[PDB]
Amino acid sequence: QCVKLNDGHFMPVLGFGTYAPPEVPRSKALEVTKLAIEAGFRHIDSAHLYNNEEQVGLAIRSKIADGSVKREDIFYTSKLWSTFHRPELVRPALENSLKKAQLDYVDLYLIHSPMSLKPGEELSPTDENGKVIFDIVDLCTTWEAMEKCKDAGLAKSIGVSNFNRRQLEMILNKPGLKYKPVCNQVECHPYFNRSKLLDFCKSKDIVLVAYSALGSQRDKRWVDPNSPVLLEDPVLCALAKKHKRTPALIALRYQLQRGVVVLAKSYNEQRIRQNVQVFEFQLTAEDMKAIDGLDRNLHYFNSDSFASHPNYPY
Ligand SMILES: NC(=O)c1ccc[n+]([C@@H]2O[C@H](COP(=O)([O-])OP(=O)(O)OC[C@H]3O[C@@H](n4cnc5c(N)ncnc54)[C@H](OP(=O)(O)O)[C@@H]3O)[C@@H](O)[C@H]2O)c1
Ligand SMILES: C[C@H](CCC(=O)O)[C@H]1CC[C@H]2[C@@H]3CC[C@@H]4C[C@H](O)CC[C@]4(C)[C@H]3Cc3nnnn3[C@]12C
Ligand code: NA
Ligand code: NA
Ligand code: NA
Ligand code: NA
């Protein structure tokens, strides 16, 4: 169940989200990534920031070595952290991710965020009064370095994450552009459905990939605990009842029917096995209109620590 990207590669339309907070033991990423592959996931979304690429890579290598899948069956995404936007830092950052994951290439390498941070290995640079330290980098030069990673064969495809229309246009208009972004991975769910951005992306043959499609993990460091809980929504729950599915499955299927590639994080064996059932049923045009009606521009991520960054995309 795949979509063709604008560079000719194919992306599975359902992806497994791997982020877990630091209070989850690092062993769990290995267990749940194997469970995801066993359940039928074939797109796996990770990042240098997640501190999990060793365990996620081991899971992938394990399922290839045991004969369950071949390397070409798995679509593995990593992301360039914002302390590595300076062009000379991009290839070493990807090479380090590949060494940790024990992989020869990623299927997809993303710019994690347009909001550049002080260069270096320290992923959370903070000043003498605890403020996040920004950097000013032309993201077109970061992009040129991403392009060289594709030409070196280290990334099959390259894309971006957390870009707005203006930031996408900056790449599309870059002089001497070699490769468009294949995707823009953004926050997208029935409370923030990104309809105009989605329209724009489709018009440029850029795939919108939805994160927080089940309403986020609601980590109180990053998400307002007063925010409404997406999966408690009465329309999603009534549709779940109507279809004998679950609110999560309704929220996933909604994205597939609108041409969005959707991620789903779960570290729970039962919910991992549940989520792959998204391909078993369909929402009517009336159901889709009811879910479109939930849109309220609700951003679970309010990036408060990136206050005043010039590249803040919202
Ligand atoms: N590019 C970026 O900046 C960025 C930002 C955020 C996320 N991401 C990526 O997108 C992924 C997903 O987004 P997310 O981490 O915000 O989480 P999410 O996919 O919105 O999931 C939120 C929560 O839903 C629960 N869940 C999963 N399946 C469910 C089911 N069938 N029924 C009920 N609850 C269910 C999970 O809890 P359990 O684990 O307890 O099942 C999970 O913690 C991340 O892991 C990461 O790979 C990227
Ligand atoms: C849940 C986010 C991860 C999203 C993802 O799944 O890609 C958090 C985890 C780490 C944190 C990083 C962790 C390192 C550092 C911690 C600082 O106190 C705040 C800035 C930040 C870059 C934050 C920024 C942030 N703002 N809202 N969410 N975040 C993220 C990216
Ligand atoms: Na740090
Ligand atoms: Na513009
Ligand atoms: Na458009
Ligand atoms: Na199924």
CSV table of N, CA, C and O and ligand atoms in Angstrom, one decimal, residues 165-170 173, ligand 4:
chain,number,residue,atom,x,y,z
A,165,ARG,N,4.4,26.8,3.7
A,165,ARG,CA,4.4,27.0,2.2
A,165,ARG,C,5.7,27.8,1.8
A,165,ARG,O,6.4,27.5,0.8
A,166,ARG,N,5.9,28.9,2.5
A,166,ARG,CA,7.0,29.9,2.2
A,166,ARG,C,8.3,29.1,2.1
A,166,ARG,O,9.2,29.3,1.2
A,167,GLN,N,8.5,28.2,3.1
A,167,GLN,CA,9.8,27.5,3.3
A,167,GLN,C,9.9,26.5,2.2
A,167,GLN,O,11.0,26.3,1.7
A,168,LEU,N,8.8,25.8,1.8
A,168,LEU,CA,8.8,24.8,0.7
A,168,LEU,C,9.2,25.6,-0.6
A,168,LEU,O,10.0,25.1,-1.3
A,169,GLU,N,8.6,26.8,-0.8
A,169,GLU,CA,8.8,27.5,-2.0
A,169,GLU,C,10.3,28.0,-2.2
A,169,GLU,O,10.8,28.0,-3.2
A,170,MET,N,10.9,28.3,-1.0
A,170,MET,CA,12.3,28.6,-1.0
A,170,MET,C,13.2,27.5,-1.5
A,170,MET,O,14.1,27.8,-2.3
A,173,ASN,N,12.3,27.0,-5.4
A,173,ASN,CA,12.8,28.1,-6.3
A,173,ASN,C,14.4,28.2,-6.2
A,173,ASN,O,14.9,29.1,-6.8
B,4,NA,NA,7.7,32.6,-1.3
